[PDB]
Amino acid sequence: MVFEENSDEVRVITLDHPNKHNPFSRTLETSVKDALARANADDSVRAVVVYGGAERSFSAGGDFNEVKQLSRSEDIEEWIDRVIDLYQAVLNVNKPTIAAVDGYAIGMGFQFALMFDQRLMASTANFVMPELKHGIGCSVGAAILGFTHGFSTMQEIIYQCQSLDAPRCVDYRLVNQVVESSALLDAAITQAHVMASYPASAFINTKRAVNKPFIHLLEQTRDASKAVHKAAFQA
Amino acid sequence: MVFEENSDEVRVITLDHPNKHNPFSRTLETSVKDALARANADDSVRAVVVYGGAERSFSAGGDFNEVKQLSRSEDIEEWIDRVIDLYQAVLNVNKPTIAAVDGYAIGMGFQFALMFDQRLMASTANFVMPELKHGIGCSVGAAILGFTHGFSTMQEIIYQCQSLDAPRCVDYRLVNQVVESSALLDAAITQAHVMASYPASAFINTKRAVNKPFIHLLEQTRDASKAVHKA
Amino acid sequence: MVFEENSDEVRVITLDHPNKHNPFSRTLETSVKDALARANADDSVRAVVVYGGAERSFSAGGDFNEVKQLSRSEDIEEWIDRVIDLYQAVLNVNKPTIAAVDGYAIGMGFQFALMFDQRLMASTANFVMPELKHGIGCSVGAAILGFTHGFSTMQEIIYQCQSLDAPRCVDYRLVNQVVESSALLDAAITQAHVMASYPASAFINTKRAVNKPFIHLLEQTRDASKAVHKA
């Protein structure tokens, strides 16, 4: 469920769920994790771009088919582990990582995007974190967003549950760039070439230092979040 | 010193100190805490709005003369503890909380407001944190504001001691909305109805998770602000 | 390598490296630390302004040819310890501190500036954190910047390695004011007089509380950054 192509030293991973909105099914997680592993392990690769695809959403979050079909505690507990593992998978890529966002980045897709070093979105795209509106728990989201963007910003976002257009994302500093849908991928690749040109020894050790507290946060959130979602999933 | 009213599932707590600027006296603390307890314990309540009242300040905070008048240290311990307990009282409300700010939100009033889930202010209102200007210590304000809005933002506010009108609060992201004084209360209630419509269990457990570090911070600050006036 | 003047209760420390870009050589660090010590220890001083000088940079930081030289594990460590000690030196000044920025504030100069209570820059000045562009490690810069201004802001800055002019710094909230180069020093001194007029008890204890987490973070970053500038 992911294409892997190359713009020279740049590896481009394109999400390809049967569904245009690239929902994170368990199969898609797997592919995305595996592609990231290969990219990180491959010396020909010096930078990575993850992309929803032309006329496709970055990801509309997890698979509503998994989520709505969750009752057992065993089942929910392990689902949270999966989710974090995915986010960690991105954070542990020792090379530069760009997220090219078009369409919708919702809930899990929003969060997934926040794991990247940089984010460019289309002028026509949207971010959303509408969990509580819908009756889903959002401790993991709160945790991430609080860490990346501050307490009061996070509060606003998760409690308002609004559809964030580009102007709004810029205002929140959720993205580094806004371009036309047609221009988006090339723009992302360029950013990747730029960061790829920074000496590797320097960039890897710095990125590691930078992402350590983030990883550590996510690990701490693991247990407590299993608690809210176990309790929430009974309606 | 409050009015408790209802817009259906929304409880509206209106501060009513004899003084139009709703200063936090001991008595007002008490009422506000008790009204919050009831609202949180009441089934019929699904969201809470706290409001200074029409043609009234949200709250000018606590008397700096009386703060400066405390010279026994348990006087200060008692007082520090009271202040935090108030802020914790808000943070422990398991339902949505909106603060409708008109007039002045000063010192304690500024801080008290930061405990809420959301904040709307009037176009004509002002936030201020002037403690250092008036020769008051300011650990608790800094601690809170650093946590809610970042180090460098807090630095600027505390050290500059300026009256922050609405444009400035928006720029700082201190509020979620600015409206006319006449429109403010209805606006706040609407927000409350919106958040009240969120499936409770999912909301409550999330809010608990969210506010936990905040509460823990207030506890750390309690100990520290009293290690100060002890040495 | 520093000239110490007085505007009444305000002490003004002007960086004076032979090089007009005030690079942080070991000698300059020393002078700056010693001038800060004296200013903090001097009762006649109630506030401090640090300035690059007219027609001179605040500081272009350390020399990236020398940094890339350091291969011996001691050399790396002692250098890191020095760098932090400098930043701590500013944080431990118990009186108000203003940084008057003209020219370039690069890497160490950017970071050094973030230690101050307030920052004014010239309209014509620039901030830069270009370490990764030039193959220099940046754990320290990121640690600081993440703490002062948030994770995602720090990310953007260190990964983009751009020259931030004034409009951009305002947009990032890196400074409290932008003025003409000619006006800059007087502006800084005024800010210093303003903060100097706040009661010393009130200020000193608050500032201590405020800067504690910052110091504690610098101390962690020290122990850590060794292992990465090592590898």
UniProtKB/Swiss-Prot annotation, chain A:
Binding sites annotated in the UniProt record for malonyl-CoA: 60-64
Keyword Ion transport applies: no
Entry coiled-coil feature ranges: none
Domain of life where this protein originates: Bacteria
Site (Important for catalytic activity): 131
Recorded family membership: Belongs to the enoyl-CoA hydratase/isomerase family.
Further comment found in the protein's record: Unusual member of the enoyl-CoA hydratase/isomerase family: in addition to decarboxylation and thioester hydrolysis steps, catalyzes C-C bond formation leading to a substituted heterocycle. Glu-131 is important in both C-C bond formation and thioester hydrolysis steps while it does not play an essential role in decarboxylation.
Name the record gives this protein: Carboxymethylproline synthase
Gene, per the UniProt record: carB
